[PDB]
Amino acid sequence: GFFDADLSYPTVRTERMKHKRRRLVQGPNSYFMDVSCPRCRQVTVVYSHATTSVECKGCSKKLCRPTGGKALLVEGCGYRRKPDH
Amino acid sequence: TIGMFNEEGENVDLYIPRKCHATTTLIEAHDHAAVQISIANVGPNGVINGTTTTLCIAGYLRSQGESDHAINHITIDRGIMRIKTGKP
Amino acid sequence: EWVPCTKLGRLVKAQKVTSLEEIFLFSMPIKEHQIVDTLIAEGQLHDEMMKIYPVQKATSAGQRTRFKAFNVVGDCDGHIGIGARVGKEVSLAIRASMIAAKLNIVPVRRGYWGNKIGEPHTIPMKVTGKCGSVAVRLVPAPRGTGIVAAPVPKKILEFAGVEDVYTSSRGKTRTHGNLIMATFYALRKTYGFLTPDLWADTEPSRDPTDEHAELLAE
Amino acid sequence: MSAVESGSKVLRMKESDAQKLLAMRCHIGTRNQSSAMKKYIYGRTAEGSHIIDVHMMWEKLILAARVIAAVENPKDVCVCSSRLYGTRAIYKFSQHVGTSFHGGRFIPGTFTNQIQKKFVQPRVLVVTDPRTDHQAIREASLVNIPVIALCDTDAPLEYVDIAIPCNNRGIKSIGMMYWLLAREVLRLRGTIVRSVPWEEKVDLFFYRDPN
Amino acid sequence: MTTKRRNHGRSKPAHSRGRVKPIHCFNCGRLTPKDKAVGRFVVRRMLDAASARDVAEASPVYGANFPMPRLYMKQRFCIACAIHSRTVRARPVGNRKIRYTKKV
Amino acid sequence: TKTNGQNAARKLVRLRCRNRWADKGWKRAHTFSARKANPFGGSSHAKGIVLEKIGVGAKQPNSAIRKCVRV
Amino acid sequence: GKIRTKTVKRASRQVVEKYYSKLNFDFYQNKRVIMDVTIAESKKLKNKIAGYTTHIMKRLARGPVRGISLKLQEEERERRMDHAPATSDVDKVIQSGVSVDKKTMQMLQRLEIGVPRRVKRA
Amino acid sequence: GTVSRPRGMRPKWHKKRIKRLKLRRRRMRQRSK
Amino acid sequence: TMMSVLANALRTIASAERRGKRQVLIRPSSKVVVKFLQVMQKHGYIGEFEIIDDHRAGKIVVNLNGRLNKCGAICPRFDCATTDYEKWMKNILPSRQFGFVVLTTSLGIMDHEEARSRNTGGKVLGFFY
RNA sequence: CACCAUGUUCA
RNA sequence: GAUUGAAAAUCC
RNA sequence: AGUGUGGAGAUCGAAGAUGAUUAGAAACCAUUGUAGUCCACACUGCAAACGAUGACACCCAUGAAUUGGGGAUACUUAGUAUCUUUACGGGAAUAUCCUCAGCACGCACGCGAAAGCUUUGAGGUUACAGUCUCAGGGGGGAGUACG
RNA sequence: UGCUGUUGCUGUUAAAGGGUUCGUAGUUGAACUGUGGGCUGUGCAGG
Ligand SMILES: [K+]
Ligand SMILES: [K+]
Ligand SMILES: [K+]
Ligand SMILES: [K+]
Ligand SMILES: [K+]
Ligand SMILES: [K+]
Ligand SMILES: [K+]
Ligand SMILES: [K+]
Ligand SMILES: [Mg+2]
Ligand SMILES: [Mg+2]
Ligand SMILES: [Mg+2]
Ligand SMILES: [Mg+2]
Ligand SMILES: [Mg+2]
Ligand SMILES: [Mg+2]
Ligand SMILES: [Mg+2]
Ligand code: NA
Ligand code: NA
Ligand code: NA
Ligand SMILES: [Zn+2]
C-alpha cells in the first residue's frame, strides 16, 4: 500500500514538475544573482532571465548575454543566488 | 434501521442492497461482477481467529481496473495494511 | 426430478435459501429456473407472452424462418423478469422464453409520490431505460392516476407491481422488443439509484455459499 | 497486511524472508511500466529493469494469505497457471494448502457453463499472470469471484482485486512466491509454527522438464 | 457514406495541411497526391544471377570482391495501378489496420 | 444548438417566425395559394353540373375502370 | 488418402490405454490381440485400429504422445520429479552470497529490518 | 461506385442540362424583350 | 470564454462524482460558489472543502462522499415566486421526497425548502440530489 | 489489358 | 384458337 | 476552369484532325493539335472549398511516438550517459527526466440506429439549461420560375 | 406531434455548419468591499 495523493497538499515530487502557472498557487520561476565583474570585482544584482544586456556600473562591461531564457553570464565572473525574501 | 419507512413505522423496502466500500454505490442484483472479500483477523500470535472483516467492491470498479487501488485504500483505512515501513 | 447443477440451486433445493432477496443481495446469477419456481410461492408467479414475430435468414435455397418470443414473468409485487428466445417452432420459442424470463428476474423498488400512507404505489424517482433507440421514462405519479403508459409498457409495469406512474417514450416505439427491454431496464434502475434513505452503513453478512460451504461439499 | 488489531509485529517481514526474495530475484521487473502497477515499483536500475518495493510486495502477500486463510473450505480456492512455469508451483501449493488447481490451457466456460460438467464454482481465484490467465479472470468477472494475481510491472489489473507485485517470469521466483504464500497460509491456519523454519523445500515448487 | 478508412486512404490528417502537390503514377501517369500514392523504393539487380555470373566471368573488374551495379528507383503508383499490379491487395476489415514501418 | 440568453426573446421570436414557414402544413394553412388552387374554394362540399361520364383506369398493380363524372 | 478416421483413432487410443504391456511393435500380433480385446461388426476397421495402435506404440517408445495417459508411467514420472535435493537452492544462493544493484541496496538500507546479512552490492 | 443510388442522370450532367436550359430561356426572353 | 463560474464549478463537481473521485479541484471560486457548496455541505451531499487563496480568484478542494448523484446550474437564472416551487421540483428534481433546488433569495442563498419556510422567492441558481 | 450489348407485364 | 399461372407477344 | 488586355508559348492539351477498336464508337487506345497551360494587371467567386464535424470556454483514462521553445543532469524532498570539435563555435548533435504550445497513433469511461467517436468527442444530455451564431423539418418539382 | 422543440428537436454518414477571416447592430460576459462577538443554559455534537 502506497500513499494516496492529496489535492490540497501536493507532494514535493508532484509539485516540483508542475508548470509555474499550473501549480496550486502560481509563483515566479526566476531569481536574482549577485554577480562580480571579472575586471574590477564590482558586485551588481542581475536577473536570471534578463533579456537586456547588463553593464557593470564601474567596468561598463557586459555581465550577461540574453538567450531564450536564463541569460548566460560572462566568463570569469562569480555569482551567488540571492535569497527570495 | 436503514430503508424507506411508512408513517406507521413498518419497513417498506423489499431489501437493502449492499453498498460498495470504495465509492459508496448500491450493488445491483444484476451486475454479476461485484465481489465480497473477507480478510481473516489475526490474534496476537500468527494464528487467525473466528472473526473476519468483509469488503464489498462494485463491478464497474473492477472493470475500470481500480479495484486493487480501492482495496489498498480500504485496508489502510481499516488498519489491516501498513502504509509505510517503519524507521530503521 | 430436478437435480441442481449449481451451488445456489443445491441450497435452494435443500431449503437453505428461502427468498429471492437473498440471491438479489449477493447478485448471484440464477442459472436454473427451478430456483425461481421454488422461491416464488405457488400461484404468485404469473407469465404472459408479450410478443411473437418471425425472423428470416436468407439461404441459397429460399430462406429460413425462426420465431422470436418475448415472455414477461412477475408476481405483481416488486418482481419482474423478461425473457426473449428464438426457436424453430412457436411452442419451443415460447417455452424457452418462459425459461429465460424466469432466469432474468430482478427486484423493483416501489415508493411514494407524496406522504407515505399504506403500501407503496409508485416508483421512488424518475428513471429512464434505453434499448436500441427506444427510451422509456417513468415518472412518479400521485395515488389513483393509474399507469399512464402505452399498452406494452403498461403490462410490464402491472407485472412489476406499480400502480401509479407517468410514462414517456422516445424512439421507434413500434420496435416492441426494444420497447420491452427499455421498460425492463427502467424498472431495473430503481434499486440502483441511491437515496438519502440508504445512506447509513449496513453491517456485512456472509454469502450463503460461504455459510453453507461445508454442506455443499458433502 | 502486516498490521494486527492487537498491534503485534508477528506478521512483519523478516531478514530470512528478505534474503529469500533477494536470492530468487522476486523484486525484478521487466523494464515495461503499467499505470496500475506504478505504485509497486521502487525504482529503475541501470540495466533498465524496474525494481519492486519489497515492503509493498510483502504487504500484498500477507493480505492474500489472510484472504485465502479466511476460506473455510480450501477446495473453494482455485489456483491457475498457464505459462508452464507455475504448473508445478500451483500443484505443490494445492498439495500443501489444500486448494484446487488447473494448469495449462483454461477451457472457456469452466466457471459459466453449468451443463458441460467439469464445471467448478470457486469462491476465490488465484492466478500466476493476469495477461496469460486472461480467460479465467474474464470468466470470474461474470460469477462474482474475487481475483488474487501475481502481477509483474506490465500487468493489466482489470478485474484483479489483490495484485501481488512479484517476478512471475522466472521459475525460481514463481516457486519462491508460491512457497512463501503456502507457508504464510499454513502459519495463519496454525498447521505449522513460525518459530521453527518450514521443512518443505522450494526446489519441489520449482518447475522441472519431465524428460 | 461509411468511412472506410479513418485517414481516408491518405497520410494527411485533418488539421495538418490543406493541399499536397500530386505526382504522376509510375505506370499509367495518373496525377495522385504524394501521401495517397502507394510508394515503394526498389533496388533491383541489373542482371539476374544466371546472366550476372556470365557477365562477371567475362568482366576483368567484376567478381567476388567487386559487386555488380544495381538499379535504385522510387515508384509511386496510383491506387488502381497498385491493385492491378498486386503490389498492394485488398485486405480483411480486421487486417486493414496493420502497417509496416520498414521494408520487411 | 440555440440561444439561451436572458434577454434573447427577440432572437427566439424571429427564429421561430422564420422556421415556421418550413412546415408544409403551417405554410399551406397560412398561405392563400392552396385555397386559390382548391376548386372548392375552402368549402367542404360543392354543387356542380355533370358535364360527362368517363372511366378512369386504376393504377398498377390494380386493374379496373373506375366510374367518374367530369362536372 | 489413408487417414485414420476419428472412430479408428479413438478406438486405437482406448486400446493402447487399456492394454499397453499386451501390445507389440508388429502389426499381425497386435491385430490378433485386437480381435479378442475389441468387439466390432467389421474387419477393415479392426485392421486399421491395429495399424494405428502399432503406430502409437512406435511413437510411445520414442516419447509420450498427446491424448494417451498411462497411469504407471505417469506415476513413475511424478515420483522421479518429486525427488527432493539434500540442500535447498535458496540456501545455496544465500551461502554463496546475494548480489544486488544500487537501487536494490537503497530500499534495503531504507527498510525497517535494515540490510540483510548475506547481501552485497554488485 | 463511390456514390449511392442517383435515381436519375448523373447530377453533374443534370446540372449542365439545366444550365443550358436556363441559357436558352434567357436568350428567348432577351429576344422578345 | 468562461461566462458562468458557478456553472463551471457545478459541472466539474458532477463530472468528478460520476468518475468516482475522492476529491476535486474547482478553479476559479466565488462567493456564490462557496455558498452553494455550503448548502450542499449542510444537507450532507459533500464533506470537507477548503478554499485556497491565490491573491486572485482563489480555488477550492472539495472532498466527495458517494452521496451526490448530480449537481448543476440553471442558466439563465429564472425568477421563481413562492408558487413556482412545485413546478420547479416537478421539472428538475427526481422526486418530491429528496433533492433540493438552490435559489438566490433576498435573504441569501438557500434551498427551496428553506425558502418556502421563510416565504420568499428568488432566482434559481441550480440543483443537487 | 483486342472484342465481350440485352432480357415484355403482374405474379 | 395455340401460348401462359394469368396477361402481352407471336403464330393461328 | 472561365473572362479582359498585354506578354510568353518548352511540355501537356478542352475543341478539332487523322489512325484504330467496334454492330455502331469524331468513346476508351495511338499520332497530333487550337484555346488553354506560364506571367503581369484587372474580373469571376460557382469545388467531395471535407474532418461531409461552426466559434469561444470547462472537465476528461492509458501506453508508445513526433514538431517547436524552455528547465534539470495518505510522507520534509530521491538518478543520468554518448559523439564530434580550427569557426554562425563559452559550439553541434545525442541520452535521461521534466515543462509549455502543435500534428497525430493505438484508447478508459461514456456516447451512438449502427458504422464509429473518445483529453483531437460524435463524452460529460429525458438525471434534458456555460455563451454566441448558421442551417434543417417526407421524396420530387427545383436551386427551377419570377422579381 | 419533443413533426417547430422557451420547457423540449435535429445538423460525421438519414434533411441540415456558412470556403475563410475581419466585423458593426445584437446577444453574452472573470474575481473582489461581506465569517460580528460575548453570556448562560442545551444537543450519541464532535475532535
Ligand atoms: K498547423
Ligand atoms: K482542398
Ligand atoms: K433514389
Ligand atoms: K469481334
Ligand atoms: K434495346
Ligand atoms: K501531344
Ligand atoms: K426532428
Ligand atoms: K459587436
Ligand atoms: Mg464499389
Ligand atoms: Mg462504397
Ligand atoms: Mg447521400
Ligand atoms: Mg470528318
Ligand atoms: Mg468563380
Ligand atoms: Mg421537404
Ligand atoms: Mg446529408
Ligand atoms: Na495510401
Ligand atoms: Na461492341
Ligand atoms: Na468491324
Ligand atoms: Zn496509375
mmCIF file of N, CA and C in Angstrom, chain A residues 1-2, chain D residues 39 56:
data_model
loop_
_atom_site.group_PDB
_atom_site.id
_atom_site.type_symbol
_atom_site.label_atom_id
_atom_site.label_comp_id
_atom_site.label_asym_id
_atom_site.label_seq_id
_atom_site.Cartn_x
_atom_site.Cartn_y
_atom_site.Cartn_z
ATOM 1 N N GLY A 1 0.797 -1.212 0.000
ATOM 2 C CA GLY A 1 0.000 0.000 0.000
ATOM 3 C C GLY A 1 0.833 1.267 0.000
ATOM 4 N N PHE A 2 0.468 2.209 -0.865
ATOM 5 C CA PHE A 2 1.171 3.475 -1.010
ATOM 6 C C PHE A 2 0.281 4.617 -0.544
ATOM 7 N N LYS D 39 2.672 2.087 -8.667
ATOM 8 C CA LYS D 39 2.864 2.312 -7.238
ATOM 9 C C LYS D 39 3.735 1.244 -6.594
ATOM 10 N N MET D 56 5.946 -3.334 0.010
ATOM 11 C CA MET D 56 4.623 -3.414 -0.596
ATOM 12 C C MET D 56 4.326 -4.826 -1.082
#
